Amino acid sequence: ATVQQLEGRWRLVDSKGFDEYMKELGVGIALRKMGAMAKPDCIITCDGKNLTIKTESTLKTTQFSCTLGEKFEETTADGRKTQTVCNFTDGALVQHQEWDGKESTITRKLKDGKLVVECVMNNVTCTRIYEKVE
Ligand SMILES: [Cl-]
Ligand SMILES: [N+]
């Protein structure tokens, strides 16, 4: 219902589809193996319309900040530089990425006290579930 409801440190507890989604992105084997193996934490913080999402692991550490509704240049973990925009719509944070004629979307929602992250590119989907670290 509100973006602030997504705030906190979250730890990955389940993943489905992520290897296939990275293959759709064209990520090479070194990076795909590290994504299959890392169990990162996701730390979400917000202040009004400003949002930061940090991903932390020994295998993988990255962060971006944005303002809801404002396009910005995002450097992704696999090294794309995308034009991204985040919006909070219908109780989910929606992150839309565009680069080189391609698009992908990541949604983040709270369900049963867990953070549910879904990604899609060209109908190839991933679903990752995180629980709060507290
Ligand atoms: Cl839903
Ligand atoms: N999977």
Curated annotation (Swiss-Prot):
A motif (Nuclear localization signal) lies at residues 23-33. (9Z,12Z)-octadecadienoate binds at residues 128-130. Changing residue 23 to A: Loss of ligand-induced nuclear import. Keratinocytes; highly expressed in psoriatic skin. Expressed in brain gray matter. Keywords: Acetylation, Cytoplasm, Disulfide bond, Lipid transport, Lipid-binding, Nucleus, Phosphoprotein, Secreted, Synapse, Transport. GO terms for molecular function: fatty acid binding; identical protein binding; lipid binding; long-chain fatty acid transmembrane transporter activity; retinoic acid binding. Disulfide bonds join 119-126. One of its GO terms (biological process) is fatty acid transport. The modification Phosphotyrosine is found at residue 130. Forms a beta-barrel structure that accommodates the hydrophobic ligand in its interior. This is Fatty acid-binding protein 5. It comes from Homo sapiens (Human).
